[PDB]
Structure 1
Amino acid sequence: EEELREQFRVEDKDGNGYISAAELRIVMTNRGEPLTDEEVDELHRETDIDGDGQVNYEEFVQRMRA
């Protein structure tokens, strides 16, 4: 539980409770940069279950457990 909470806080740079596309790019750049910016956009869309353009904590956890 706190494991994912801590990791989410690391990815959420401005502390607004959401991971943005740019925040997800930073995450991917720091783990080998396997994707292009366009592809990170697609990753962000698939993770954004409720479609508000943001990845919240519940959406992060569903991804992390898959």
Structure 2
Amino acid sequence: EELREQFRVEDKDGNGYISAAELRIVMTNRGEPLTDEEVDELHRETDIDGDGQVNYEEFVQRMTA
């Protein structure tokens, strides 16, 4: 579905997680100038279970906002 496809676009190495670096790429491509350190905090906020990675369920939870 559309959420699955968007997750796949943001997951560059295809390991099922969106990393901080992959989130930086997302924000760059959205034309949102964010510093690396700011993206770090956005990544942390998205990482509900605190394993340091954004999985698909966490991506969906944020996209539902």
TM-score bucket of the superposed structures, by smaller chain: over 0.9
Tell me how far 1:34 sits from its aligned partner: 2.6
Tell me how far 1:51 sits from its aligned partner: 0.1
Unaligned runs of 5+ in 1: none
Residues 19-66 of structure 1: per-residue CA shift (max 9 Å, x gap): 000000000000113311100000000000000000000000000011
Secondary structure at the residue paired with 1:23?
A: helix
Q: Which residue of 1 aligns with 2:30?
A: 31
Aligned residues between the structures: 65
TM-score by length of 2: 0.97
What is the CA–CA distance in structure 1 between the aligned matches of 2:33 and 2:60, rounded to whole Å?
Answer: 21
Percent pairwise identity:
98
What is the CA–CA distance in structure 1 between the aligned matches of 2:27 and 2:33, rounded to whole Å?
Answer: 7
Unaligned runs of 5+ in 2: none
Bigger shift: residues 9-18 or 33-42: 33-42
What is the CA–CA distance in structure 2 between the aligned matches of 1:52 and 1:13, rounded to whole Å?
Answer: 19
TM-score by length of 1: 0.96
